[PDB]
UniProtKB/Swiss-Prot annotation:
Disulfide bonds: none
Molecular function GO terms recorded: electron transfer activity; heme binding; metal ion binding
Binding residues for heme c: 13, 16-17, 49, 77
UniProt keyword terms in alphabetical order: Cell membrane, Electron transport, Heme, Iron, Membrane, Metal-binding, Transmembrane, Transmembrane helix, Transport
Protein name: Cytochrome c-552
Purpose: Mediates the electron transport between the cytochrome bc1 complex and cytochrome-c oxidase.
Keyword Transmembrane helix part of the UniProt annotation: yes
Gene that produces this protein: cycM
Topology with respect to the bilayer: Single-pass membrane protein
Main location: membrane
Subcellular location: Cell membrane
Amino acid sequence: ADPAAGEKVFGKCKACHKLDGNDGVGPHLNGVVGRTVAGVDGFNYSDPMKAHGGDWTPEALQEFLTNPKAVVKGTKMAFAGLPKIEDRANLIAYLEGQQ
Ligand code: HEC
């Protein structure tokens, strides 16, 4: 629930994601909470991501951020994961502020 702490955790995402609407290694993450999974038009998602379905609910997001390949097997997102629930919670709060 701490957006300020979440901002710091986002430092682990900035190498591939932006919050300014621009897509790069990964799709822009501004407005990602509750967003259709694989919903950014034009971004070249992996087949597993496109087949996942549903939305990026806070729960779906926290699980994915703990272990990306366990939630979306075969994803092209090469991030090891955030093992601490507090870090995931704070990051999600930060993302929610950037909706
Ligand atoms: C590059 C080395 C990455 C790092 C570090 C992080 N992410 Fe990522 N992410 C990356 C790619 C290439 C992709 C597409 C994956 C695919 O299989 O197509 C993604 C995707 C996401 C998504 C899905 C977004 C959607 O529009 O469906 C999310 C929610 C996401 N990434 C979140 C995220 C966060 C919060 C990170 C820091 C903890 C993070 N990613 C790091 C590449 C990379």
